[PDB]
């Protein structure tokens, strides 16, 4: 799950996680549109992490949100400064830090591509859907 205020790129522009509904198009890891097949209610009180990438993108996500790295899938709580790079399909960004922060409301989406990936944050960082 990602914070409601997380900007997500779409084929036409930018939406927030809070504004995502079933049937909306996000972008998959290949930069092409992918359809939202499910989207949770707002979830409150989840432990959250602030994940900062080498491109300047900062995403707040719950502790168990999953990220594709070159060494494996890692949750936000397991991400390591420097040691971890986001990799798809080609290196995308490096993890600079992941730190526990105050809880904010979050939501999960599921998307219709088999990799279960979509782009998130102003830098369009690949991340795993539920
Ligand atoms: Cl893995």
Numbering used by the authors: 1 to 89, 106 to 146
Please quote the paper that reports this structure.
Protein splicing is catalyzed by intervening protein sequences termed inteins. The protein-splicing reaction involves the self-removal of the intein and concomitant joining of the two flanking sequences (exteins). All splicing domains found among inteins have the same structural architecture named HINT (Hedgehog/INTein) which relates to the C-terminal domain of the Hedgehog protein (Hh–C or hog domain). Instead of the N-terminal serine or cysteine missing among class 3 inteins, class 3 inteins contain an additional nucleophilic cysteine residue in block F.
We determined the high-resolution crystal structures of two variants of the class 3 MchDnaB1 intein (MchDnaB1_HN and MchDnaB1_HAA). As observed for other class 3 inteins, a mutation of the last Asn145 residue to Ala in the MchDnaB1 intein (MchDnaB1_HAA) largely halted the reaction at the branched acyl-intein intermediate. The WCT motif found in the class 3 intein participates in forming the catalytic triad, in which Cys124, His65, and Thr143 could serve as nucleophilic, basic, and acidic functional groups, respectively. However, the crystal structures of both MchDnaB1 intein variants (HN and HAA at the C-terminus) lacked electron densities for the N-extein sequences. This observation is presumably due to self-cleavage at the N-terminus during sample preparation and/or crystallization (N-cleavage). On the other hand, the variant of MchDnaB1_HAA shows overall weaker densities for the second conformation in gauche+ for Cys124, which was not modeled. In the MchDnaB1_HAA intein bearing an extein residue, the distance between the Cβ atom of the +1 residue (Ala) and Sγ atom of Cys124 is 4.7–5.0 Å. The rotation of the χ1 angle of Cys124 could thus bring the nucleophilic atom sufficiently closer to the +1 residue, promoting the trans-esterification reaction step without requiring the substantial conformational changes reported for other class 1 intein structures.
